[PDB]
RNA sequence: UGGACCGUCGUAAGACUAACUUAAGCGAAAGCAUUUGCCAAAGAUGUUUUCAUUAAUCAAGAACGAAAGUUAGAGGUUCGAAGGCGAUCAGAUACCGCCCUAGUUCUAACCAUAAACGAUGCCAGCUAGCAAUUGGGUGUAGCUACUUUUAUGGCUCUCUCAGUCGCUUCCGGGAAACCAAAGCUUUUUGGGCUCCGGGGGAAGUAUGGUUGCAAAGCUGAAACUUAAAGGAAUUGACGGAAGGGCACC
């Protein structure tokens, strides 16, 4: 729930989505 | 260690599980030591009381 | 192993300590060093000891109030149950140092490092506070930092002159009556009126040699 | 009381302790004294808030005292708080 | 909903003010937001004075005291009950009460 | 206690274990107990005798114990919103009791 | 006639020491503590044990002829507590009421000029 | 085990600047406490000095930026993400307990954020008391210091700037809590100036540009979903919070 740990639930998508996207280049 | 002691003044009894009058009490041969001991059970003023452990009294305020 | 069958304290023999000449009576305690052996020298363990005593125990003070000058002495040279015990510094007891520092004041502390004409190189730790004036309803009485860095210089140019200053035959006699807290107060009251001033600590970090000749003269 | 009928003419003494800027005009509390040192003779005129060690060319006796605002002559003063 | 005029405690024009470890939980709480208690307590506590002054050597010596300035986290002085829960009209006071006697715990 | 530094610190850590347990029992204490919670059924290991029964038998069964505690007879012959508020009915007991003497 | 050792009573949380020694401090007389007197590993701090320490030292130094002592409390304040624990007053009553006629009652607990970083870490010891 | 812990004197180290310590100061904000020397700087006051609108505020842009983090070099005491134990627990990758590693620290750069809060942009004027209170000014028709009645120094009294902090109140505003500004935003109001908000989510997400060694930073949607979500205050718990006061359900 916490407003801070969702900033981290999402900041660790943005490096799964940046990793996965740029391995596919 | 057969010291006797008589009470000059009662203080409050912390009752609920172990009703005991924490009472100020002086000895007979060492009557200048009006120590504040804890006496389980019903007591009256001026009651003389036997003792062995006459050294420290388990200090608790009021 | 050692394994003494009874009481290594029975090996310990009493030794009577002796103060130097300037204070008072000399016997001020009893040290317990083991009786000597081939590789136990009774002379050898006594030399390091820095012994703690008060000034009231050295000035015939029956009512302890002026006791706070803890003149630590160093057990210097021994002979025949009698160490000679040179001087090693002077703290101030914490019942008296911590008592002075209330809030509502500014303390000024000066620390010097000055060498006597003898080879000792001391370090004296003076302490000031600002005295409240009469009819001062204002509850602070604070100094102004050019009224502190003045006073911190105003102590440092004084108590250096007492160090080059009729030394430890006589310098500790100035510490007997605390004359140095009397020269400070008149000389600082031209700047800001100071409260009780005391020098609180001296450190004797550079003792030169023996000079047993003067030391036996120092044991008068 | 703030509801006074009059604000233009004040009492004399309060505008003498209002400010140098907050009076009904501006007027400085400076002036030009005429200091003669008691140790010598020369008529010297100076600013009150002088800010300069101003002793005479042949009379360097005391003539002034060095400080922030108005120089405060101690026991070496003889002047006149007046236009010279 | 602002609870205090001064917020936490007393930070007027400094920007930011140094921390202090709380005395019994070692919590970094700042200096002005710190329940400062300053005890001058006797060393025998009032019942051994009649026992020490028997075995005193001198003319009663009179015995020294302690000198320490204790800091507290705000929880660790609500739990110790140095400081509790004033009313809404009594959160506005700083100056009273003792009102009874000299205060104990010195004594 | 084992002050002997010429005995293994990595193996006297268990010699300090199973001997402090037997010394307290040798004076007055209850034998240590560990309840093997197998499949919706318990097995209390209270005495040393059932504890010593238990140890050698799982050198033979071993890893299929939970599936043989519920099924094997001869091993069973030898050895013979509704949820949270019972799961916190007991945690409230501890915090009220492990904190009243906290100071 | 009179002879003066010291006491060095170190009374903390969880334990109390009574360490009577020379006027120097080196050669000790009756090193014992209260923690070697009650067999519970929590009872070490009790005022009974500080007496039960001081019921032993105050006679033993008399067997070494000690007539008089000086007292030095300790808290254990490093960065830490900086007040003597529960059995500090329990010793000096037990020591002085065993015919050791003493005067010097000092408190050498350490007191630093803002030294390093006590443990717990910035929120620590959550209970 | 015979010598930990304690005592003691001694050596080496790295870190930190207590007590004094404040509703005290300084700083553009971040932040800022041993002595001293140096080093440029600055607000305030004092000013019958000079210049004469040189000003205000600011898109872009520029410098500074706690902590963590990163690159290299040193050091490395205590503390200590992670790690490993010991417990605790129904479980505990947690709290508590021990060990410590990166980190903490110093120079060289990068990063550019924070509850970076006064959740209050900035310059100007006005509208009230009272109490302190840091600087500087000024009058003692004050005391006091002794160097002397003195004079420098301190205190007290009086006034004034620049203020700051509190209270008291509006006899101003507000949804209120409150605010001497959050007031003079009056009755369809006007001292300039800039930045920002438009029901809640989705979402600081997706994608493009741009900066970074990287972590990440700045820019930044919509499809879709939905009727409430939110602010302040009252009354419900003498329901696991203090302080009281009862009775053998």
Curated annotation (Swiss-Prot), chain B:
Disulfide bonds: none annotated. GO terms for biological process: cytoplasmic translation; maturation of SSU-rRNA; ribosomal small subunit assembly. GO terms for molecular function: structural constituent of ribosome. The keyword Ribosomal protein applies. GO terms for cellular component: cytosolic ribosome; cytosolic small ribosomal subunit. Keywords: Ribonucleoprotein, Ribosomal protein. Pfam families: Ribosomal_S28e. SUPFAM superfamilies: Nucleic acid-binding proteins. It comes from the Eukaryota. Belongs to the eukaryotic ribosomal protein eS28 family. This is Small ribosomal subunit protein eS28. It comes from Drosophila melanogaster (Fruit fly).
UniProtKB/Swiss-Prot annotation, chain C:
GO terms for biological process: cytoplasmic translation; oogenesis. One of its GO terms (cellular component) is cytosolic ribosome. Disruption phenotype: Flies exhibit disappearance of the follicular cells of the ovary and abnormalities of the associated germline derivatives, leading to failure of egg production. One of its GO terms (molecular function) is structural constituent of ribosome. Keywords: Cytoplasm, Developmental protein, Differentiation, Oogenesis, Ribonucleoprotein, Ribosomal protein. It is found in: Cytoplasm. Ubiquitously expressed in stage 8 embryos. During oogenesis, expression is located basally in somatic follicular epithelium and in the oocyte at the later stages. The keyword Cytoplasm applies. Essential for oogenesis; required for late follicle cell development. Component of the small ribosomal subunit. Mature ribosomes consist of a small (40S) and a large (60S) subunit. The 40S subunit contains about 33 different proteins and 1 molecule of RNA (18S). The 60S subunit contains about 49 different proteins and 3 molecules of RNA (28S, 5.8S and 5S). Belongs to the eukaryotic ribosomal protein eS1 family. This is Small ribosomal subunit protein eS1. The lineage of its organism: Eukaryota, Metazoa, Ecdysozoa, Arthropoda, Hexapoda.
UniProtKB/Swiss-Prot annotation, chain E:
Keywords: Cytoplasm, Endoplasmic reticulum, Ribonucleoprotein, Ribosomal protein. Disulfide bonds: none annotated. GO terms for biological process: cytoplasmic translation. Residues 86-107 are annotated as: Disordered. Its main location: cytoplasm. GO terms for cellular component: cytoplasmic side of rough endoplasmic reticulum membrane; cytosolic ribosome; cytosolic small ribosomal subunit; ribosome. PANTHER family: 40S RIBOSOMAL PROTEIN S26 (PTHR12538:SF0). This is Small ribosomal subunit protein eS26. It comes from Drosophila melanogaster (Fruit fly). The gene is RpS26.
Swiss-Prot record, chain G:
Keywords: Ribonucleoprotein, Ribosomal protein. Residues 107-127 are annotated as: Disordered. Transmembrane segments: none annotated. GO terms for molecular function: structural constituent of ribosome. GO terms for cellular component: cytosolic ribosome; cytosolic small ribosomal subunit. One of its GO terms (biological process) is ribosomal small subunit assembly. Residues 118-127 have a biased composition (Basic residues). Belongs to the universal ribosomal protein uS11 family. This is Small ribosomal subunit protein uS11A. It comes from Drosophila melanogaster (Fruit fly).
